[PDB]
Each structure stands twice: as structure tokens, then as C-alpha cells.
Amino acid sequence: XXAXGYX
């Protein structure tokens, strides 16, 4: 992924 979250 490389981005994050959380949704």
C-alpha cells in the first residue's frame, strides 16, 4: 500500500 488509513 504505502499510504495509511483508517477508513
End-to-end CA distance of the chain: 14
- Using H for helix, E for strand and C for coil, what is the string for 1-7? CCCCCCC
The identity of residue 5, as a single letter, is G
Rounded to whole angstroms, the Cα distance separating 6 from 4 reads 6
